[PDB]
Amino acid sequence: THHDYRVELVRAAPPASTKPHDYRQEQPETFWIQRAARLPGVSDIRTLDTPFRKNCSFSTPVPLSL
Amino acid sequence: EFDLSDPLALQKELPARISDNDMRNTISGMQKFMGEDLNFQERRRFQKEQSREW
Amino acid sequence: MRECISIHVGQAGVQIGNACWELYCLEHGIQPDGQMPSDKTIGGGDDSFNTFFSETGAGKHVPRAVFVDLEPTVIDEVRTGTYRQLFHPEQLITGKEDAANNYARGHYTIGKEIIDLVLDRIRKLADQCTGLQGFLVFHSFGGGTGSGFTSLLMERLSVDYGKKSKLEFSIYPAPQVSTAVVEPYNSILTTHTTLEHSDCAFMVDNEAIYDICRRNLDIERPTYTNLNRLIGQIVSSITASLRFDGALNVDLTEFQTNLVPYPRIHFPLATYAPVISAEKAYHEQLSVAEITNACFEPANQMVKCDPRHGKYMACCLLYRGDVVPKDVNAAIATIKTKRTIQFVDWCPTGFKVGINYQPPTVVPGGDLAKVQRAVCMLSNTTAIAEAWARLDHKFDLMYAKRAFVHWYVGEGMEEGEFSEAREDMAALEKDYEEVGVDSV
Amino acid sequence: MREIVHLQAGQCGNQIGAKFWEVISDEHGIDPTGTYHGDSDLQLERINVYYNEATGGKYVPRAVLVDLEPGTMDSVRSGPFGQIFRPDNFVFGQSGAGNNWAKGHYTEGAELVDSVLDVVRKEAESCDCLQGFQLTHSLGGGTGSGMGTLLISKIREEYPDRIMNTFSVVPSPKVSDTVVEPYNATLSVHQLVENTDETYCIDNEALYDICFRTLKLTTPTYGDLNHLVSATMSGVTTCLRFPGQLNADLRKLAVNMVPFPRLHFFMPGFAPLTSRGSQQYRALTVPELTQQMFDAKNMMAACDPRHGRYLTVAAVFRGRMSMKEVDEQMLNVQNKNSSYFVEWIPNNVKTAVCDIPPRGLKMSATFIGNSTAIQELFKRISEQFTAMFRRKAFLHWYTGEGMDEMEFTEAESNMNDLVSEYQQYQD
Amino acid sequence: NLAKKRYIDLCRQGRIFDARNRIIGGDTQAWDFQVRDQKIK
Structure with a gap:
């Protein structure tokens, strides 16, 4: 089966990335991530590398604020 | 008021959305919607590239 | 102002609070020295840390945590590890001799010397929380301080605070593979404090987590880190609606409403769905409908109970990442078609969904692949009454020859607790059968 | 003003x-x-x-x-x-x-x-x-x-x-x-x-x-x-x-x-909604707008008025459009289909014409309809109340707020009047 | 007297109307010197 079914001379190797990818600190793209400012459930955007962190600066009471 | 009773008003007319880049399609004119997705396929493709590299 | 104070009791409690709390440093920006490095030129907008972390003037964040032990050797590794400037020096309580696999030592004799000091650091961490949701309890049913002293920790916390939420995450003993002999005397006798003095209760067994991590991941021979790491991915996803934005937001008060029908009845089951390896994340699409149905599987539950034996009372889903409301609502309807999952006669509606935005955080040196979706599901089931039945057997088996009983009745522990707190379980095992029976 | x-x-x-x-x-x-x-x-x-x-x-x-x-x-x-x-x-x-x-x-x-x-x-x-x-x-x-x-x-x-x-x-x-x-x-x-x-x-x-x-x-x-x-x-x-x-x-x-002061639950619907590929295939005339007010798929309630009788009907027309063609098409829907209309009210239609359309539009149309097919909206709530209530299901969340179980029992039968009040006009 | 009091009240206004650094804070540069001296002793 090795001698008969062997296939060589193929276009080997995975396709080229065209961007630098690290799996440690890169988040997937989503319908939500590409349309992040125009979503009904998204708060204020004031962080880089992730738009979806809670930003409760408008809603905290004036007694309890920074 | 001849324009109400034209014989050719249906010919001499425009649809409300000739293409996706047309000027008279605002929020109150309910032809253009926010959740139609033309960026869907490119976003899905780059999602798959991101998954592969991770 | 969405605070929660964690309480970690025992070596099981401490070593879980080392892996929960290196998740919450990476989830936000905080390093092991306490500083948030992104605080400069971007400040005030990130109020997400305020649930768990507490700010000082220097830009240093201190957790809302209390670590309790009755032995010095577990916390002293925490006191000089990597995270030794993160914790306040007085939030780590240690005794001098441990309770030594014995309920009565940690309750009646040895736990009387730490309850006066621990109940004073709780007051200082709850007199700065302007709105406290509720405490969190991480303990082990089988040890001495995890079981003897927690039953005395909870009993004061009824008086001291009244009707705040006291959630608990416990390690119930495994039905087959245990690391003790006096294990069922402890685990029976602490049922009467997780019955009265708990508002919700989650009882995982470490044998079930061994099954998932060997099979769903690819760690043959895991250690207790890879078990602590999976427990941290549930406590974060429960509280991820308190810190990051969501299309639908559900709180600790809000699923308490939607999961417990009667106040004797609070024992759900935790199941976190995509736990797959990085090589087998290459080959599997991980859509919303494909992970919402792996929660229901009897091979992925983290208790050694099968929900095909009993009827679901309520369910609580917690979606996270790149989901959509159109597809969360689309795949719930599939579950309702199949008979193989059945709901109870008196719960026609059934569910409670929660949709967050910020996807879960991968940990460097961890094992789970970095994905874009998740589900955490907390279902209430009649088929949890078998897990106390495989331990009802092993209490009366050992107690009929009255073995090991001199180690308890010589500590100032009376004899009538053995015949009572087991016959306590002889009604909560009969309560769960009647609250599922089909109507007349 | x-x-x-x-x-x-x-x-x-x-x-x-x-x-x-x-x-x-x-x-x-x-x-x-x-x-x-x-x-x-x-x-x-x-x-x-x-x-x-x-x-x-x-x-x-x-x-x-x-x-x-x-x-x-x-x-x-x-x-x-x-x-x-x-x-x-x-x-x-x-x-x-x-x-x-x-x-x-x-x-x-x-x-x-x-x-x-x-x-x-x-x-x-x-x-x-x-x-x-x-x-x-x-x-x-x-x-x-x-x-x-x-x-x-x-x-x-x-x-x-x-x-x-x-x-x-x-x-x-x-x-x-x-x-x-x-x-x-x-x-x-x-x-x-x-x-x-x-x-x-x-x-x-x-x-x-x-x-x-x-x-x-x-x-x-x-x-x-x-x-x-x-x-x-x-x-x-x-x-x-x-x-x-x-x-x-x-x-x-x-x-x-409203003919009687307890019967005020209606069913809206908006007419000129067009799919994006079918946008160029449609023209904006008057019967293109009364074919989609009265279409039973269009309605903004999940109940069907072919199961009941229209007590009264409204219509609001927007645009610059002809008063004969407005009036002749609402007589037209009354006459082809005259078992979906109550007998004891002879005319069942109110009409109104506004001049200024929505922006970028030529014509538009809106609907408000009163039905005896909306007593099928409460009986699917009653069947999932007393199925759940008769075993006292989630009751501790409500009674411990300071309520009583008789307060449930009246809200059984006060809503069950509206089921049977509406029912006697289908008879 | 008057010029000393006027400069004192202006610097007091400047050091108190920073709202965060009034209700919270400290002197890290002095505390480093104090812990260094205690180590030397």
Whole structure:
């Protein structure tokens, strides 16, 4: 089966990335991530590398604020 | 008021959305919607590239 | 102002609070020295840390945590590890001799010397929380301080605070593979404090987590880190609606409403769905409908109970990442078609969904692949009454020859607790059968 | 001169009304900041129905936003038009209800009701001749339905002659996302029937059945469900802001719809909705608009009026269009199909023509219909109340707030009157 | 006397109307010197 079914001379190797990818600190793209400012459930955007962190600066009471 | 009773008003007319880049399609004119997705396929493709590299 | 104070009791409690709390440093920006490095030129907008972390003037964040032990050797590794400037020096309580696999030592004799000091650091961490949701309890049913002293920790916390939420995450003993002999005397006798003095209760067994991590991941021979790491991915996803934005937001008060029908009845089951390896994340699409149905599987539950034996009372889903409301609502309807999952006669509606935005955080040196979706599901089931039945057997088996009983009745522990707190379980095992029976 | 004070409550009520104000402000040429930047003169003539005046020629709405959790005020303040609202109009409590009618009605929603009634009594007495109020809420949550009916009870004990109107999103039966919702909805319909003049029924199931079937959208969201509720929140009040060949305000449609004072649950629908590929294949004439008011798929409730009898019918037409062709097509629908119409009312149709269409459009059409096929909307709530209530299911969450089980038992039979009151007119 | 009091009240206004650094804070540069001296002793 090795001698008969062997296939060589193929276009080997995975396709080229065209961007630098690290799996440690890169988040997937989503319908939500590409349309992040125009979503009904998204708060204020004031962080880089992730738009979806809670930003409760408008809603905290004036007694309890920074 | 001849324009109400034209014989050719249906010919001499425009649809409300000739293409996706047309000027008279605002929020109150309910032809253009926010959740139609033309960026869907490119976003899905780059999602798959991101998954592969991770 | 969405605070929660964690309480970690025992070596099981401490070593879980080392892996929960290196998740919450990476989830936000905080390093092991306490500083948030992104605080400069971007400040005030990130109020997400305020649930768990507490700010000082220097830009240093201190957790809302209390670590309790009755032995010095577990916390002293925490006191000089990597995270030794993160914790306040007085939030780590240690005794001098441990309770030594014995309920009565940690309750009646040895736990009387730490309850006066621990109940004073709780007051200082709850007199700065302007709105406290509720405490969190991480303990082990089988040890001495995890079981003897927690039953005395909870009993004061009824008086001291009244009707705040006291959630608990416990390690119930495994039905087959245990690391003790006096294990069922402890685990029976602490049922009467997780019955009265708990508002919700989650009882995982470490044998079930061994099954998932060997099979769903690819760690043959895991250690207790890879078990602590999976427990941290549930406590974060429960509280991820308190810190990051969501299309639908559900709180600790809000699923308490939607999961417990009667106040004797609070024992759900935790199941976190995509736990797959990085090589087998290459080959599997991980859509919303494909992970919402792996929660229901009897091979992925983290208790050694099968929900095909009993009827679901309520369910609580917690979606996270790149989901959509159109597809969360689309795949719930599939579950309702199949008979193989059945709901109870008196719960026609059934569910409670929660949709967050910020996807879960991968940990460097961890094992789970970095994905874009998740589900955490907390279902209430009649088929949890078998897990106390495989331990009802092993209490009366050992107690009929009255073995090991001199180690308890010589500590100032009376004899009538053995015949009572087991016959306590002889009604909560009969309560769960009647609250599922089909109507007349 | 005929002012409308908007009230809106809950996450459902604050996310419907935020899109509705993006509909109105464009319709009157108002920027995101508030300033007027229009072209016509009719856009600035009856703007005082909905807008006040600030200094420097800047218009601020008469909207009072109500919530029990503080996290849906930040969503609205920092949205697209969140800077047009006066910040004192936002009302928020610092702890929610969490899907509970009792915390809405007695425990938590009674300490917040006395601070909104100091807001609305400041906005209702600042009108030269106040026409009425509005509400926008849902019968599934805690603050939409619990305190959202506490508010209506205080209004109609204080301003009884004025119009009270509601756009209720009653709970969807078969796409449902709360176990404890039939307790909330069954306990809330006695408070609707004694304290509302009109009330509209909206199901989110039947807003999805437009966006899949009619519009052929790929990925709709809640932004395209609020986009349709505001389409019929503006067509009811379009003869109050723009002149016509025949006018109808919010009262004249109420005079002509309810024959008996307990029968005010209706069924909206908006006609010229066209899918994107079928947009170029359609022309805008009059029978293209009455073929889609009266189409049974189009309706914004998930109940079918072919199962019942139309008590009365409305229609609001917008555009510059012919009074013969308006009138001849509504006789046309009455005559082909004359078993869907009650006998004892001979004409069952009220019609009104407004001149000024929605922006960028030539013609438009709106509907309000009263049915005996809407007693099939409450019996599917009664069957899932007494199936669940007879075993005392989630009852400890409600009785420990200070209630009684007889308070449930009356809300069994007060809503079961409306099942059998409506039933005797099908006979 | 008057010029000393006027400069003192202006610097007091400047050091108190920083709202965060009034209700919270400290002197890290002095505390490093104090812990260094205690180590030396």
